[PDB]
Design a protein around this ligand. Sequence first.
Ligand SMILES: CC(C)NC(=O)c1cc[nH]n1
Ligand SMILES: CC(C)NC(=O)c1cc[nH]n1
Lengths: 411, 411
Amino acid sequence: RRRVVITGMGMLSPLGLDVPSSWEGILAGRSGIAPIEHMDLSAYSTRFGGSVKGFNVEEYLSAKEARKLDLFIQYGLAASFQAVRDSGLEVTDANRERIGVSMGSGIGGLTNIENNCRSLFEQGPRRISPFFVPGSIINMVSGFLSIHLGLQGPNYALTTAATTGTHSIGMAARNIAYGEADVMVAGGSEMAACGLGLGGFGAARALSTRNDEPTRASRPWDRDRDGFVLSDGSGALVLEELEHARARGARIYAELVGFGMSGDAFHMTAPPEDGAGAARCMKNALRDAGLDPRQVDYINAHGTSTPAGDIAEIAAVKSVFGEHAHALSMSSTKSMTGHLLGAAGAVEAIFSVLALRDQVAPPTINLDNPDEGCDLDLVAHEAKPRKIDVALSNSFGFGGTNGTLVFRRFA
Amino acid sequence: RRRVVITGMGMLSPLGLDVPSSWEGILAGRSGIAPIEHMDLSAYSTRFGGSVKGFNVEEYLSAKEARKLDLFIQYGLAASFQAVRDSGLEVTDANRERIGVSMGSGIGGLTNIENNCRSLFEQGPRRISPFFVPGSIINMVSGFLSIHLGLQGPNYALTTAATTGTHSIGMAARNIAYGEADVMVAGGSEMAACGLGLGGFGAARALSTRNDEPTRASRPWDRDRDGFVLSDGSGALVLEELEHARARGARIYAELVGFGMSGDAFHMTAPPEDGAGAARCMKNALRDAGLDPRQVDYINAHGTSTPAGDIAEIAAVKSVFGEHAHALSMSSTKSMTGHLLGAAGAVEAIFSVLALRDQVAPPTINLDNPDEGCDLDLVAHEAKPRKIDVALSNSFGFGGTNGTLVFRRFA
Ligand SMILES: CC(C)NC(=O)c1cc[nH]n1
Ligand SMILES: CC(C)NC(=O)c1cc[nH]n1
């Protein structure tokens, strides 16, 4: 089985329009959460979220091309273009069949759907945009990236709710490991802040309603948590076979050593109280990496700020790591970014890789009063410089679909 | 030890095809910035700039000669011919060895290089013009001017990015001071508005992207500034030893009393936040002039409309001038002209000399909301008649290369 390394990273998040600006916010404990400006939400129970501020699509695409694409596609292409530039890779006739794309989304083009739905109900079907389908379907980040850069390798898209970015990266790594590609651009994107998004998650009572203090709403493992915060953006990584990277003198950030999956097979939105599914998934990833639990230094948690979810993840980490659960550091960067849904696993993979580069555990902000049994090192309030050789990233999605990635300092 | 005065000036700018037309625009607060007409930029993130409008090279050169020369050389020769005519100097066998030229450029013949590169890639090397080298190299403004007018004195060219025009004038003044010339034609020219120029500065994210309001894009010290505006043109001055000027009854505009240089030694494109390099450079120029900071009445700023640059220049002016920083007037004429790069220091030297002639500080247009700490007299919006005995002109360039000129009312 071939080794897979990370040679390029790209991002849009509520904290920044690139990786270095986002990471500066993470290490400073900055919130990207604010009242939403782009629609009137006076009728909604949640009126805040994590928006991308000041995005200029014309840095990436012509105004002509951009007009045809939903925001989630613009965001996915921005992160992908950043990652490919960051990698330094040159695409040629000799390698274009060996370079593929796996960029996913949880909910896809809900804004475009809403806008075309308005035209349809008011004025009938002949008002629908000709670009409605190709500019809204989830696989068009992978499609449009492949067309723009001439990538002819495996071309697909995952949609697994909060697990999307984690599955996208893990399965792209499998393509490289088993020899069906040498390079993959993998990750996810999301822009679900429309009436149907805030209204839909609101109707399921999944969202924090702390409208008076939006920056305090996302509070993983805190006793006063009341649901997740909806956020927008994108993450992309260039995954590359090790000898391919070495041959061209690529800068290597870290090694992707492990990928695990499981299903809870329990409930449509609630985890089992002991997080048994999450425990199996983390053990599967560590076994894939050939690592003992005692070798893990940092966990980037799922940690969405939900009553049932946050405590199930603690139970799963205690089950897998035993006494070592009190030696590792675990934090939820969703305390600062909110929940990017299909992009969460992509941006959190990048944060896990930068924790390895910079030897620092990002904080869990807003952890004022840890709940019953939440007695691990959850890196409350402030970043913690420490030794990190192995970093684990968890994603648990609606339906009980679980994914874990394991990254290692490269040697 | 000899005194140096200005006896002739010439210009092409986005505001006019000569000095008086350009200065009328400056004092009226007119913008020279517009959507670019000479190429299709529909695919670029910046689609506007400061173009020279209605330039006729046949006013200066035969069609034969002009066809051999890049636009930046045509522009440099136009300004130089204007300055020499303006000075009234007669070139003879008795003085031609005592008259030299120092005309520079930041980027030089990028248009010609791009056009010859197209021929080379499509049709191979025998399609390259025989005039490609002598018609594109930066020293051919000095070369062609010397041949056309029979000037046999010191003959050279500076290339120091945004500092080019300032270094060119200061070093020409040193030649006269030290006795190696009695007259120098000095300044700079630029025409970087080709695909490689807009594309190159765009790729570095150095340019404003305010395509919806081009005349509002250049907004030095304004909280909503987002990078510089690329502009084209040329400036030339006839510098002359004082007794030489007096003897022939020359009209004297002003005295060039000081020239200072420094390097930031900090970063390739960013200044130090406190502008320590700019402060050393201004002090060096004042020490050269034998002036105290309290004697400065007007500063023509570098003021390019960049986030880091504009606030560094304020810090440097506060450091050098102390309480007097609130008594002098400082403005950026790039608010109107945009950034002429290698020509910026030449056209801004001319504006500093005319501020002395006319006793008026040109405005900083578009200064709607001055940023934190930008609380000096920045001559917002409208020209300000006032007493000006001493005017300073600043230029700070890529690489941290700094130059300052000091001009005085002549007595
Ligand atoms: C999103 C739901 C189904 N899952 C969890 O919150 C969770 C926590 C631990 N294992 N699973
Ligand atoms: C062009 C860059 C390198 N320099 C400045 O903008 C600047 C401002 C004050 N000192 N330096």
